[PDB]
Amino acid sequence: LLKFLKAQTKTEEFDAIKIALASPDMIRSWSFGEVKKPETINYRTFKPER
Amino acid sequence: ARVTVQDAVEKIGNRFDLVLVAARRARQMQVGGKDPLVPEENDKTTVIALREIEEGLINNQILDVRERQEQQEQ
Amino acid sequence: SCDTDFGVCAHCYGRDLARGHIINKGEAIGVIAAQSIGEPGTQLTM
Amino acid sequence: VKSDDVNGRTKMYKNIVDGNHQMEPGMPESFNVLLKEIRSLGINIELED
Amino acid sequence: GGLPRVADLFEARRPKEPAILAEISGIVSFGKETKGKRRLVITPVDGSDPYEEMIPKWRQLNVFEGERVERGDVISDGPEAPHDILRLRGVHAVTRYIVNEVQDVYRLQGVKINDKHIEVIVRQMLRKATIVNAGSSDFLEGEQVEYSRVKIANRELEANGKVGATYSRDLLGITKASLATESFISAASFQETTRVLTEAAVAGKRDELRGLKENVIVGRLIPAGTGYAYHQDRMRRRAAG
Amino acid sequence: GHIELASPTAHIWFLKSLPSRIGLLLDMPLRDIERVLYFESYVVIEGGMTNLERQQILTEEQYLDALEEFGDEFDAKMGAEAIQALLKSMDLEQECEQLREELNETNSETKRKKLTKRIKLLEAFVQSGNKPEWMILTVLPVLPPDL
Amino acid sequence: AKKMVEREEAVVWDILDEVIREHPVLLNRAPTLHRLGIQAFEPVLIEGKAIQLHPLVCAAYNADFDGDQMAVHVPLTLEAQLEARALMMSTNNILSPA
RNA sequence: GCCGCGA
DNA sequence: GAATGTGCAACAGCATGATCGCGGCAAGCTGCGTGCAAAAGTCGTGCCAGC
Ligand SMILES: [Mg+2]
Ligand SMILES: [Zn+2]
């Protein structure tokens, strides 16, 4: 489970940029999670929020 | 050294394809596995390729047939 | 009146003003024309 | 290869130090940033194959 | 005068006082039920389909008699808009008018500019033809002249030659003909980006990166100069699958 | 990432523009839609049995009057949820066919431009695979932190 | 190599002269109006801090020596070097494309 | 971001 | 002879207004609280192993 490259393979062949409206399902597909707290960084630990 | 490239322009006339041909020849003579066909005057490979084009012993057709010959040799 | 699609013929466009020869394929003539027209104007007396 | 190619810059530097003068271009990060901004709106933009 | 007029000429802005023109046969008719609305309703029979025009009477009429007024003749004096020249006189006339008029500004101030450069930009103003016929999936819309010419040629090549639809060529300003390009990546990097993105989003269109600005934004080789050779080889690969 | 709004909101991109997509897609003026979008007026939907129209712009007082008189069969919502419901309830194909029938049956230079613009937008919507209900969003994406 | 470049020994200057020999470099002035406002040149090393520009091209640059400044870009690619030598060189563009 | 400055 | 729509003009809102450099400042600092289980960490205390 070694010798893997992702930065190099991130350059994928492409053409014809396409633009359309974003469905809620597609937006959730983009999303890796849900944000619920307005705070960003706590000063008690100098670490990002949960 | 070549101050002007008009002779290279008139050897094969596009002013655009000669850039590609000279870049290919410079790559061949720079990355290795090739030697200049014109006496080397301590100048860089770019002008050596341009002078080879100007003197008429480097063009697209003979470069392609050279690629074929070295491909068939191996 | 070039009649060609997506570009201009090398004959309908005359010789390029930079060199005595006729213009060759692949020359971006639109940018050259726009720069030629817009280079003055800074000296036009409005 | 001069401004926004994160790996292109390093590849170009390595080639020049080697002495290759090879381009090996890539995808500028500015356009990826622009795509992320546009997707952050209600607009979906993507690259076709 | 001056040179806020090179911009005005290229913007194709109609002047304050247009000079109306006539049709093939401008027979004298004076007025016809002019009444309150305008005055001097000219009704040239021209054999068939008379061309009714309305004049607000604030402008005098030059040609009193019939005199067999031909198409494009000046019925009333005044500065003529370039739009009317294209409709009535032809494509060549609008190029001759724009080129001569814009060269007046440059020649007065001692500036030498070749006529080809002005004609090249005029060509970019002479796209987006409007169809006045039907049959070939086109009807009263603004469509690229290149697409219309290509579709007509294919239709004319086949047996069904009557499917070809006649078109009317339009003249747009440089600020307007730029935003009317069929590719959304360009024309959104120049002017109002909010408007272009909404129309591009609802239409679900594609850019295809055919021009110079798109490839510059993406970072590929532009399809011009040295990059023209690379782009041509790629096209054959896509065509050949 | 994303955030769920727990209540549909209207995209400022489409509602506020001189050629407003939803405005000319609903055959209603920008003043009325911008008015319902801030709860100051109600829009009723359906109500075929009652005398209320499909796109009525009845205000609050008219809402209480209808509730006293019509009671049931009157479905009106104040927020963008009503806009979403009446966007979903629309049948694009039959509306486009009716618009084309009206355009070819009656010729008038005043209504011709509006009919052509509406049919063009409807054709683009049906052919592009988009859905009008996606115009107003219930889930909001957020930018990556490093940007 | 990095340390000896920082120390700037004489052989470093000799190698810099060797590298500079026939590598074109393209100079441009700030308000690039037409395509002649950016031109390729063969560099010659001078013991100073100001760029020495050939007078005959100044009319093309709209540049006068009363405080003007110009920027230098290195075409660090074989294709870029050929393009600078064959398309950008001052000896190449003598007639203006207007 | 303001303020001043060079072509 | 009164009635019904099409053209039309004033009007309010949107979008834009050259490029590349240099030097200095002044900020911009952001939002609880709560009482308890539940957990985790800590401190005073005693332990064996090395010199
Ligand atoms: Mg000066
Ligand atoms: Zn032609």
PDB file of C-alpha atoms in Angstrom, chain G residues 3-92:
ATOM      1  CA  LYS G   3      26.687  28.600  -1.064  1.00  0.00           C
ATOM      2  CA  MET G   4      29.326  29.381  -3.690  1.00  0.00           C
ATOM      3  CA  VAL G   5      26.794  31.401  -5.694  1.00  0.00           C
ATOM      4  CA  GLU G   6      26.016  33.380  -2.537  1.00  0.00           C
ATOM      5  CA  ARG G   7      29.743  33.940  -1.966  1.00  0.00           C
ATOM      6  CA  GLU G   8      30.087  35.115  -5.608  1.00  0.00           C
ATOM      7  CA  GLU G   9      33.529  33.824  -6.523  1.00  0.00           C
ATOM      8  CA  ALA G  10      35.241  34.724  -9.797  1.00  0.00           C
ATOM      9  CA  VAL G  11      34.502  31.341 -11.380  1.00  0.00           C
ATOM     10  CA  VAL G  12      30.830  32.032 -10.633  1.00  0.00           C
ATOM     11  CA  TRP G  13      31.095  35.167 -12.781  1.00  0.00           C
ATOM     12  CA  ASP G  14      32.860  33.172 -15.505  1.00  0.00           C
ATOM     13  CA  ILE G  15      30.083  30.561 -15.504  1.00  0.00           C
ATOM     14  CA  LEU G  16      27.465  33.332 -15.578  1.00  0.00           C
ATOM     15  CA  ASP G  17      29.194  34.760 -18.655  1.00  0.00           C
ATOM     16  CA  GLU G  18      29.201  31.277 -20.203  1.00  0.00           C
ATOM     17  CA  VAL G  19      25.472  30.838 -19.519  1.00  0.00           C
ATOM     18  CA  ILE G  20      24.539  34.328 -20.765  1.00  0.00           C
ATOM     19  CA  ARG G  21      26.401  33.780 -24.054  1.00  0.00           C
ATOM     20  CA  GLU G  22      23.457  33.340 -26.438  1.00  0.00           C
ATOM     21  CA  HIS G  23      20.379  33.123 -24.218  1.00  0.00           C
ATOM     22  CA  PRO G  24      17.925  35.812 -25.388  1.00  0.00           C
ATOM     23  CA  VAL G  25      16.022  37.857 -22.819  1.00  0.00           C
ATOM     24  CA  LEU G  26      12.898  39.893 -23.541  1.00  0.00           C
ATOM     25  CA  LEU G  27      12.465  43.471 -22.326  1.00  0.00           C
ATOM     26  CA  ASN G  28       9.169  45.331 -22.061  1.00  0.00           C
ATOM     27  CA  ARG G  29       8.070  48.798 -20.984  1.00  0.00           C
ATOM     28  CA  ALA G  30       5.105  49.403 -18.710  1.00  0.00           C
ATOM     29  CA  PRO G  31       2.360  50.672 -21.099  1.00  0.00           C
ATOM     30  CA  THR G  32       2.574  47.955 -23.754  1.00  0.00           C
ATOM     31  CA  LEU G  33       0.422  49.488 -26.493  1.00  0.00           C
ATOM     32  CA  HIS G  34       1.337  47.433 -29.576  1.00  0.00           C
ATOM     33  CA  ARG G  35       3.286  44.212 -30.045  1.00  0.00           C
ATOM     34  CA  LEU G  36       6.550  46.131 -30.549  1.00  0.00           C
ATOM     35  CA  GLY G  37       6.473  47.204 -26.888  1.00  0.00           C
ATOM     36  CA  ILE G  38       8.056  43.893 -25.852  1.00  0.00           C
ATOM     37  CA  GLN G  39      11.188  42.816 -27.711  1.00  0.00           C
ATOM     38  CA  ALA G  40      13.887  40.172 -27.367  1.00  0.00           C
ATOM     39  CA  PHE G  41      17.548  41.112 -27.040  1.00  0.00           C
ATOM     40  CA  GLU G  42      20.873  39.359 -26.671  1.00  0.00           C
ATOM     41  CA  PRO G  43      22.198  40.393 -23.238  1.00  0.00           C
ATOM     42  CA  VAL G  44      25.694  41.738 -22.653  1.00  0.00           C
ATOM     43  CA  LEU G  45      26.802  41.949 -19.031  1.00  0.00           C
ATOM     44  CA  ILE G  46      27.674  45.456 -17.835  1.00  0.00           C
ATOM     45  CA  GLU G  47      29.144  46.612 -14.520  1.00  0.00           C
ATOM     46  CA  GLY G  48      26.265  48.796 -13.430  1.00  0.00           C
ATOM     47  CA  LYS G  49      22.661  48.883 -12.291  1.00  0.00           C
ATOM     48  CA  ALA G  50      20.826  50.423 -15.277  1.00  0.00           C
ATOM     49  CA  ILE G  51      19.684  48.683 -18.451  1.00  0.00           C
ATOM     50  CA  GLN G  52      21.488  49.965 -21.539  1.00  0.00           C
ATOM     51  CA  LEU G  53      18.977  50.117 -24.399  1.00  0.00           C
ATOM     52  CA  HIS G  54      19.789  50.498 -28.085  1.00  0.00           C
ATOM     53  CA  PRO G  55      18.566  53.947 -29.237  1.00  0.00           C
ATOM     54  CA  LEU G  56      17.052  52.813 -32.559  1.00  0.00           C
ATOM     55  CA  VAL G  57      14.370  50.738 -30.797  1.00  0.00           C
ATOM     56  CA  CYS G  58      13.354  53.542 -28.415  1.00  0.00           C
ATOM     57  CA  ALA G  59      10.876  54.977 -30.924  1.00  0.00           C
ATOM     58  CA  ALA G  60       9.270  51.528 -30.975  1.00  0.00           C
ATOM     59  CA  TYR G  61       9.178  51.450 -27.162  1.00  0.00           C
ATOM     60  CA  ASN G  62       7.966  55.069 -26.831  1.00  0.00           C
ATOM     61  CA  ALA G  63      10.799  55.213 -24.291  1.00  0.00           C
ATOM     62  CA  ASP G  64      12.944  58.221 -23.405  1.00  0.00           C
ATOM     63  CA  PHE G  65      15.827  58.392 -20.935  1.00  0.00           C
ATOM     64  CA  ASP G  66      14.272  60.761 -18.407  1.00  0.00           C
ATOM     65  CA  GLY G  67      13.431  58.245 -15.680  1.00  0.00           C
ATOM     66  CA  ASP G  68      11.814  55.423 -17.636  1.00  0.00           C
ATOM     67  CA  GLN G  69      12.008  51.896 -16.239  1.00  0.00           C
ATOM     68  CA  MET G  70      11.696  48.568 -18.026  1.00  0.00           C
ATOM     69  CA  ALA G  71      11.178  44.935 -17.047  1.00  0.00           C
ATOM     70  CA  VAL G  72      13.171  41.865 -18.065  1.00  0.00           C
ATOM     71  CA  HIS G  73      11.829  38.335 -18.557  1.00  0.00           C
ATOM     72  CA  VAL G  74      13.904  35.214 -19.226  1.00  0.00           C
ATOM     73  CA  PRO G  75      12.483  32.774 -21.821  1.00  0.00           C
ATOM     74  CA  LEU G  76      13.802  29.722 -19.965  1.00  0.00           C
ATOM     75  CA  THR G  77      12.659  27.092 -22.476  1.00  0.00           C
ATOM     76  CA  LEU G  78      14.020  25.792 -25.772  1.00  0.00           C
ATOM     77  CA  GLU G  79      10.758  26.605 -27.551  1.00  0.00           C
ATOM     78  CA  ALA G  80      10.667  29.943 -25.725  1.00  0.00           C
ATOM     79  CA  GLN G  81      14.274  30.652 -26.731  1.00  0.00           C
ATOM     80  CA  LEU G  82      13.525  29.876 -30.386  1.00  0.00           C
ATOM     81  CA  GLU G  83      10.399  32.048 -30.246  1.00  0.00           C
ATOM     82  CA  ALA G  84      12.392  34.928 -28.756  1.00  0.00           C
ATOM     83  CA  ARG G  85      15.117  34.523 -31.383  1.00  0.00           C
ATOM     84  CA  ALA G  86      12.838  34.003 -34.404  1.00  0.00           C
ATOM     85  CA  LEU G  87       9.722  36.038 -33.508  1.00  0.00           C
ATOM     86  CA  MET G  88      10.671  38.569 -30.811  1.00  0.00           C
ATOM     87  CA  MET G  89      14.156  39.759 -31.821  1.00  0.00           C
ATOM     88  CA  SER G  90      14.593  43.454 -32.578  1.00  0.00           C
ATOM     89  CA  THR G  91      16.303  42.569 -35.861  1.00  0.00           C
ATOM     90  CA  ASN G  92      13.153  40.633 -36.806  1.00  0.00           C
TER      91      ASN G  92
END
